[PDB]
Every structure is written in structure tokens, then in C-alpha cells.
Amino acid sequence: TEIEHLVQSVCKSYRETCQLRLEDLLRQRSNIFSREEVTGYQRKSMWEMWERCAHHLTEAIQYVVEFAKRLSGFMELCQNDQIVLLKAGAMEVVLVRMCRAYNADNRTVFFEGKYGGMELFRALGCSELISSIFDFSHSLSALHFSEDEIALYTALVLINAHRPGLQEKRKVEQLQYNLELAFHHHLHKTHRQSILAKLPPKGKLRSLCSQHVERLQIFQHLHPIVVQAAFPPLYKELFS
Ligand SMILES: CC(C)=CCC[C@@H](C)[C@H]1CC[C@H]2[C@@H]3CC=C4C[C@@H](O)CC[C@]4(C)[C@H]3CC[C@]12C
Ligand SMILES: Cc1cc2c(s1)c(-c1ccc(C(=O)O)cc1)nn2C(=O)c1c(Cl)cccc1Cl
């Protein structure tokens, strides 16, 4: 069916843009920052940690932009709608992708080549927001997302006809309905429909991610970093 091909193309787009390989991430779980290395990060200036973390986060976004660009029918949307969907959803996808890099056993994340806890980031002074991000990954870790499940769920995070400001809402609805069918179909074929009831509630991802982006906007205002835009019109609604 056109649906099994849509499943295959979404998984392919994901596989090509997932940035880090699951085998690598799982294999390096034992490669953990030492007390001294942690202290090294904690003593850095707020502004150097910000530069590092901002560069890594914009690179994560760019992989999500390529994921979207390779999604069947994503380019056939009007550029306004491309921007609206990426502007509402790209960071939500990055926060979802974090669960693959996150180890629930010791509440660590993969960062510059090893695993560390949220205290790595103490110099940024965002204790409560970073803790929220870690908690969200802790929740998503319990689902043991397969790669294809992550691919199909993140596709649906982006392709959402409820985002305000769409010019061709019906064209987005058609992608969304197809991806919904692809996702349900896949879950049925793998006996994993049970994850549907365990998915994060939409307002949760939305309000966590809008706080995150709001804090990044504030740091970017106090201490601008500069990046070579992959999607210039989209860069402009965030680097404006
Ligand atoms: C609040 C603030 C100013 C910063 C947030 C600090 C911290 C929570 C950020 C900084 C770098 C991020 C990772 C970057 C890259 C990836 C790879 C992606 O494929 C999956 C996600 C992941 C691992 C990001 C996770 C969140 C990190 C650690
Ligand atoms: C939903 C989205 C939020 C968000 C996006 S999209 C982008 C972004 C990045 C690059 C490109 C591109 O074209 O290369 C396009 C978009 N940055 N960003 C941020 O929150 C952000 C980051 Cl990650 C770092 C520093 C400052 C900020 Cl404000």
C-alpha cells in the first residue's frame, strides 16, 4: 500500500538524520564523566557553557530540519507552512530524540563524548528547566521506543494541522492522516499499540518545549551565538 511505502520512507529519513546511532549511544553508556571532568564543566563560565550547548542544540535542530525535508510531501507544502510546522515542532522533536541519548539507570545524558547528569550544566543556572528536560526523558525512556516508533512519532510531532497560521491546512491534514495511519499500522503489525496510551500528553511537550525555547531566546539576547542557517526563513523567526 502507499502506507507501507510511507512507513519505509519515514524510517529511512530518520535513519539518515538521527545524528547519533543507537548502537553507539547504548555501547557508550559505560563511558561516564569523572568527578574531575564534571567539576571542569561546573567551573566553566555560564557564557562558555552557553556557547557549547547552543551550538549542539542548533545542530540537533538542523538534523530535525533535514528529517522534515526528507519526509514525503513535506516539501510539497508551501514554504509558509514548512516554517510554521518547524517553528512549532522542531525543538519538541529534539527533546523527544533526547530519550535515545538518555540513560534512566543513572539519569545521565550523552554530552561531548561521555554520559553525565544534569549537574554538568550547573554554570547555566537553569536548574529547574534542565531538571524538567531530564524528567521528560526519564518518562520517555520507559517506552523503550524502537527506532521506527521514534521516527513515526516525531513525524507526527512536526506534521500537525492544529498549529496556528497554516495557509494550506487541508494539505497538512492529508499528510497528518497518512502518518497517523502509517503509525497505527506499524504499531499493530509489531504488537506495540500499547505505547499509544503511554505517550506524553500534548500540553506537556508543548509547555516544556516553549519554556526551553523561551530560555534559549533570553540567553541568545544576553549572549548571541551565530549559526549558518540550514533553513534561512525559519532561522529568521528565531534569530530575528
Ligand atoms: C537550558 C539550556 C540553556 C540548555 C540545555 C542543556 C541540556 C539539557 C542540553 C544541552 C545540549 C543538549 C543535547 C544536544 C544534542 C543532542 C542530540 C540529539 O540527537 C538528542 C538530544 C541531545 C542529546 C541534547 C539533549 C539536551 C542537551 C544535553
Ligand atoms: C523550534 C525551534 C527552536 C529553535 C529553532 S527551531 C532553532 C533553529 C536553529 C537553526 C536553524 C537553521 O536553520 O539552521 C533553524 C532553527 N533554534 N532554536 C532555538 O531554540 C535556539 C537554539 Cl537551538 C540555539 C540558540 C538559540 C535558539 Cl533561540
Side-chain angles (χ1 to χ4, degrees), residues 121-127 129-150:
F121 304 101
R122 184 190 86 192
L124 297 165
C126 285
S127 194
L129 169 58
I130 294 175
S131 192
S132 292
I133 295 184
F134 271 59
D135 292 344
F136 185 71
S137 273
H138 206 65
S139 291
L140 270 191
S141 95
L143 277 50
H144 297 97
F145 270 139
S146 78
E147 288 298 275
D148 298 346
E149 286 167 357
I150 282 219

Side-chain angles (χ1 to χ4, degrees), residues 18-20 50 52-54 56-57 60 94-101 109-111 121 124 126 129-130 133-134 212 215-216 219:
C18 57
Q19 189 179 7
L20 314 171
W50 157 240
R52 287 180 186 238
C53 289
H56 301 314
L57 279 163
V94 169
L95 293 182
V96 170
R97 288 179 164 214
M98 185 174 157
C99 67
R100 296 162 78 250
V109 64
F110 188 75
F111 182 80
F121 304 101
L124 297 165
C126 285
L129 169 58
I130 294 175
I133 295 184
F134 271 59
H212 187 219
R215 171 57 52 185
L216 297 181
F219 267 109

